[PDB]
């Protein structure tokens, strides 16, 4: 799974 | 708001041999939204301890879900799958046929 270290990805 | 009616298939894991161990499946697919209630009926009565797969979906975003129990078919026994979805006025019942 994506290592979503971000949520440079909120909608 | 998009709502889709579930397709239903009632079937066994292997071709039914009377007196032998088998699995009874009810495959619900193509529905939306994800909320649904699926029951397996033995002679018109709900079966306790009926498992299901984890909620996943196809490329068209429609959900699919595999419900199942372990059974040994006999001649006197009738089986059905009762499917409850908001898209249906009343629960849809599909009898289990040995050749479908």
């Amino acid at each position: 799974t994506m290592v979503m270290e971000l949520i440079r990805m909120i909608k | 708001m998009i709502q889709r009616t579930p397709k239903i298939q009632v079937y066994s894991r292997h071709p039914a041999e009377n007196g032998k161990s088998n699995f009874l499946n009810c495959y619900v697919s193509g529905f939306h939204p994800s909320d649904i209630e699926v029951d397996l009926l033995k002679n018109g009565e709900r079966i306790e301890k009926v498992e299901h797969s984890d909620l996943s979906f196809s490329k068209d975003w429609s959900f699919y879900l595999l419900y199942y129990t372990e059974f040994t078919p006999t001649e006197k026994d009738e089986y059905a799958c009762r499917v409850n979805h908001v898209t249906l006025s009343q629960p849809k019942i599909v009898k289990w046929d040995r050749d479908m």
Partner: protein
Amino acid sequence: GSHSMRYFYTSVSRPGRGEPRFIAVGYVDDTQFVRFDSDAASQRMEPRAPWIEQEGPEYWDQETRNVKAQSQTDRVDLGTLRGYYNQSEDGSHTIQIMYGCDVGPDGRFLRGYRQDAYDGKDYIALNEDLRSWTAADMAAQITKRKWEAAHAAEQQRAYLEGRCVEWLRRYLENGKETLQRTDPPKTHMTHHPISDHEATLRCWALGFYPAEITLTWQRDGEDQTQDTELVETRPAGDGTFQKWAAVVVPSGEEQRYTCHVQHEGLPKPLTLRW
């Protein structure tokens, strides 16, 4: 041949009932190997195939924090998108996300996917160029500008071309005895007269892996797709699949009809007759 990895997230809001349900599943080809359920007890990423259980505690910790992360992102996204669409507070709504990769027989990267849905229809999707986005409507155009400014597509592509493919390749080796096997269909034919004049021919295929299969009927060698009831391919619940194709014929002529079975586990396509 070619293989795929796929993750499917589903977040369904339940206003009043509490916090949005979150479901996550992972697939290699037609095989599910992991799972996460917000309403389940453990609150961890769980194994769903034997070959993933050789992954140590660090893996399970990473996957659980990544999948809990995603769950919280969908949480605030659910609120946002409700606002985009001017929807009431008391309505249930669904965010669905899919990403994953394809590799060739050599394990080389073929394709990347990243697509999101709101209420069962397209919202936003990564393109074949792994660089631009496609918005379905006006609400998705707002998300598309945020993602452009945050350079999300670069992150998407970095994952799809890296972590995704190399872990796909890892799974195919570690689960070779399960993932790289082809089970050929066990075929057989049934018959059901509907009258003294007409009868049903049904061609079965069972116990096959992977799911991809093709059943066709032929009267006198010409294709038949004008009577062929094809059921959607279904799971047997043991890692294999089933499918049948039925045709209605005038009684006495059934020897004209042949069922044709094309599958990956078949050296050459089968032919059946009553």
